[PDB]
Amino acid sequence: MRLSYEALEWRTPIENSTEPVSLPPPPPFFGQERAREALELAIRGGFHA
């Protein structure tokens, strides 16, 4: 069936375009918890990875 605009709009709304933002630095491998955990195991165990 025909998809409406609301079923196609994917962009998140923008509240403002001029206001500088400050955010804390993300932890290493953010969104990469698999790679982070694998590397943590390799480092703690000394395994080749």
């Binding site: 069936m1 025909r2 998809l3 079923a7 196609l8 923008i14 375009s17 001029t18």
Partner: protein, 279 residues
């Protein structure tokens, strides 16, 4: 980070929304020469694609170009049905190889056509499928929904809408499978339609499995909101043909009736030729 660097360069150092959209637009435009040439050719009439009215056996199949940048664009796919043995020819797949390479796309379409329509033995039609103009680089692994709907229209003498471009892959069941670079294909068809002028009815028929993949550009979405561009999501080739031909598969004056009537006509021509040869 590279896009952010480009936005900072175009923004002076601050990455405002305007700067980031400018960077994205500039990155898109830096590889836009091929699409500029294609749109200029379409406007000048060197490449004539139909974006209005209806045509028999012709669809606007959305394809991705051979060029390293991945730009979608419509190509006029034409199917012609002739009386004879059950043998489907993909002209742009047998262009220089020949010998029944078993492309796995001809096999899929042949399986769908032979299993779906059973009123005789071997299919009484031979289908020739071709692309007008040569930039398509048609995929051999996956059969196209445009190929199937064009073949059905050629068999049944079905005037399909040239307003709507057809994209998507199909298996022998008729279910429409997801295809890659759906955004590129939709945006390429929209570029062609805008270059030729939006009639308020042009659209794209795309697989519903690509609905999660439709991250369309701002311009296409603004057109969709205004009602100048439409997006149809389909699951089977039957409903894609329903949308294109503007009628239902079943019931009186249905699409199945017309397709079976065309097949019966071709079978009658076969048998009349046999009788004429006999006597």
């Amino acid at each position: 980070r590279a896009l952010a660097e480009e936005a900072a360069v175009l923004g002076g150092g601050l990455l405002t929304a305007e700067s980031v959209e400018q960077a994205i637009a500039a990155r898109e435009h830096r590889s836009f020469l091929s699409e500029e040439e294609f749109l200029r050719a379409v406007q000048e009439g060197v490449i004539r694609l139909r974006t209005t009215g209806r045509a028999v056996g012709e669809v606007n199949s959305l394809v991705v170009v051979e060029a390293a940048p991945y730009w979608g664009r419509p190509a006029r796919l034409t199917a012609r049905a002739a009386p004879g043995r059950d043998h489907l020819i993909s002209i742009d797949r047998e262009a220089g190889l020949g010998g029944q390479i078993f492309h796995k796309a001809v096999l899929t379409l042949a399986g769908y056509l032979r299993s779906r329509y059973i009123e005789h033995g071997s299919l009484p039609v031979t289908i020739s499928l071709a692309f007008e103009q040569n930039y398509v680089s048609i995929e051999g692994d996956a059969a196209g929904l445009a190929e199937l709907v064009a073949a059905l229209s050629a068999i049944g003498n079905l005037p399909l809408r040239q307003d709507l471009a057809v994209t998507g892959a199909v298996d022998q069941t008729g279910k429409v499978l997801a295809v890659g670079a759906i955004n590129a294909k939709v945006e390429g068809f929209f570029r062609v339609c805008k270059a030729l002028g939006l009639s308020g009815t042009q659209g794209v028929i795309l697989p519903e499995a690509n609905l999660a993949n439709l991250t369309l550009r701002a311009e296409v979405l603004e057109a969709v909101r205004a009602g100048q561009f439409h997006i149809y999501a389909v699951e089977t080739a039957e409903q894609a043909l329903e949308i294109l031909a503007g009628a239902r598969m079943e019931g009186f004056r249905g699409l199945q009736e017309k397709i079976r009537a065309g097949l019966e006509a071709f079978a009658r021509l076969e048998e009349g030729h046999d009788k004429e040869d006999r006597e």
